[PDB]
Symmetry: D2
């Protein structure tokens, strides 16, 4: 009761109880929203994880790279929430980049095939999702994507960064198409969070030199952030996503809200 009350959100990207979408989904349900979830290949796996959320919600399979899914999407969602009911929010907390494009291989060594598979799932996928769901969304609705500041080159994230720069730009062209439907398209740029995947790298999985850089990346975050930064609490970013699906930011589209403690506005 409050904020997301009586809205229908479709949260994607969950794959562990650590995943930044899981935390969005929880806060959403906490605000009175009827959710719909999305999965990839380990389905039975996320089914278990999702079964832990404050309340029950469906799980539709969605491999962003798969055409059939993107075509089937619009309908599958309808049967789930009831026909004649339209979608109020779409969270795109999804992204991917192979070991090579990330920190194991240096920038110049990642082949386009990998660099491609990457930009497809993190950049382009936002657009293909906006397409497949736009028709069934309520006006005053909201589409939102998870992103990180790519304005400055930083070590270790190598290509995943470019992927995000593309993503930031795609958001702007999605802000156009959505506009006609009276839908807002935004991006929340988050600071680092120890998710299962992030933790693994800091643990020296994708190279020792990479894990050390990401180690020194987080370290510098709380240093700049005037309100500090807890890289193990996804609630703060999760609650900003809510503010962006709630009708409280009704005049902002093709934008980026920063959930990073203010680090991006500080030099040192």
């Amino acid at each position: 009761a409050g904020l997301l009350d009586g809205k229908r959100i479709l949260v994607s990207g969950i794959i562990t109880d650590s995943s930044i979408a899981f935390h969005i989904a929880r806060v959403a349900q906490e605000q009175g929203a009827q959710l719909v979830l999305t999965g990839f290949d380990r389905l039975r796996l996320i089914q278990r994880i999702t079964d832990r959320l404050p309340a029950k919600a469906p799980l539709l399979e969605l491999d962003v790279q798969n055409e059939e899914h993107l075509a089937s999407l619009a309908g599958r969602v309808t049967e789930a929430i009831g026909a004649g009911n339209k979608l109020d929010g779409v969270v795109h907390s999804i992204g991917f980049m192979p070991q090579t494009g990330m920190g194991i291989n240096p920038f110049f060594d990642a082949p386009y095939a990998d660099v491609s598979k990457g930009i497809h799932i993190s950049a382009y996928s936002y657009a293909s999702m906006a397409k497949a769901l736009l028709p069934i969304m309520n006006p005053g609705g909201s589409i939102v994507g998870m992103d990180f500041d790519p304005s400055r080159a930083m070590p270790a994230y190598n290509w995943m960064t470019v992927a995000k720069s593309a993503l930031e730009s795609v958001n702007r062209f999605v802000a156009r198409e959505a506009g006609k439907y009276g839908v807002r398209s935004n991006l929340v740029a988050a600071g680092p969070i120890r998710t299962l995947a992030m933790s693994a790298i800091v643990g020296g999985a994708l190279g020792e030199e990479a894990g050390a850089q990401i180690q020194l990346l987080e370290e510098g975050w709380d240093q700049r952030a005037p309100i500090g930064w807890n890289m193990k609490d996804a609630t703060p970013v999760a609650k900003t996503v809510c503010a962006l699906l709630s009708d409280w930011l009704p005049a902002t589209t093709g934008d980026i809200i920063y959930a990073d403690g203010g680090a991006h506005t500080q030099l040192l």
Copy 2:
């Protein structure tokens, strides 16, 4: 009940039922917030205007340029809301610039004295206000200033623009000091709104050539904004200010939220 429920906000800058603070103040009271107001020289005047708000709220005199006020501020607010009660929000919907620094005189003709009086009330004043009230604010609190995109030079606003560029920067150094107290310092950049003062210029008060430029400025706003733009409805911007005093954007400080329909992210 909801959002601003049980918080104490101090809204400043009201001077007519058209003023963008008046609309903030109303939406705030609408959300269950105990307000405190600020005035300048026409006091009995705004007393009448404020008496129209959803509920009763005090009115403390505050001339931002006057030292005595800035010193007296911290206490005057305390007696009003009760000693032992701390301030949860501070809205700085205030700004000024003489005819010369605005559109009547061309950029080069405005003398520093005027350019000064301007930057004092619109730029520096944010800081002097953060100082005078910071000590009595609750952690998790929020300070917010009204601003407009100065990244690109535009006609008619001449110096008032620079004033805002300074303002955008002062916000960042206020984000530092507030951080220790666990307070957030932000800026909401709004599109144009027909306030009494704005209407007057569009009516050719400050020169005919200026009024025509501001005429063609608003005209181009809805053209770019994907969700359109109503320059006679301050609610949208007013509700974004609320989102920023509500604890729903808890990891953003020294920032700028755009309440402009998305115009700033579109070229044409």
Copy 3:
């Protein structure tokens, strides 16, 4: 004699006497630089075009998407300019995007395969070129790419824009690798120029609605640009590229110089 005197530049992207690289190449030779050129598929074709430049220069075949070329590149260039002589400049005036990703098809209708082929030739290719040539460049050298402002969404350029946003980001990660070799990596963001390819679209080739938008795009350029803008004179942008290969901007890397008359700093 002067500026580019006694330097070795490799200019790529020529395909007509209208092409923005052709104009770079000419101004370069005009400044006393020994050039090397690059071609794609219509070779005999550009051989004729290049034969018109102020002085003779070689022509090496380079299909940016082809591995063999990128491997063969480093050597082919060496035999040309003489072994033991190193490259002083690298111009990447190259880019591509299919009809669909441009203005014929709306944003949502362009398939990843096309969106891919696009980003490969305009974004990633800068990096693969930096790799293949970095080893043979003289310290104090310079790599430069042709780009356009993607910060704001604009009609008609649809995906080619994202391609450029990726490009702007890749430049920053190329600025790193080049740094060790003491090489600078930059981008010159140009205004519109009536090249053969541009002229064709303004002539309603890729749709009538697209040609009209690009028509109204150029129209608005000279309107904002304080020094005006001639979209049929590539010299201005061509001479900025020279300033960036000359050792006169020796402390700027991973950057973007604007050759647009100042339009990007003006709103209206």
Copy 4:
């Protein structure tokens, strides 16, 4: 002979052989430019310093805050370079901020009077200078100001930063007025340089805590800069200023060129 050959530049801001204008002036004279210099209060003092430049040049007294000077300026320059000869370049390597507004006093403690005197000499003064000299400049001319990146809040520079944010904005409105005359107005944002004034602070003059911050500021500069950074060599920035008065960047106005080694494009 070359670059600045046969041009007339007016370099301001010299006050020691360490001053970043002195180095501009030298490189300028090195390029075949007839210079004109400007002084403040210690005249006989800079007369000695300037007498050391590669060749002889006049010295006109110019206190930027003084009206009489700004009125007298246009003529004094004419008698110097000969009537009927017009000015080709104007360097505004000038700025000031009291101890309090800098690092001795924290942000909130600097009084507007000081904050004023500061913004007057570093922000507004650029405009008043553009006015007083614009009438006598040759088309294709160039006005240039010394600046530093203010986008992110940083310690120690406190208000001098805001002063620069205002400065960056004033440049854009000067880019307009100059445009009609076909003059370009730009800003070169430099990294730190050990000038007499800078050295003094790093030596703990303006507080020990401030000197340590500026100590750690420079330290972090070379860390980010891909091509490194020598904070004791003003030549690199001085040669970028030349590139901007030379007619080699002819399509850039109301802009900022970065002479910082690329630090501003790198995070860590």
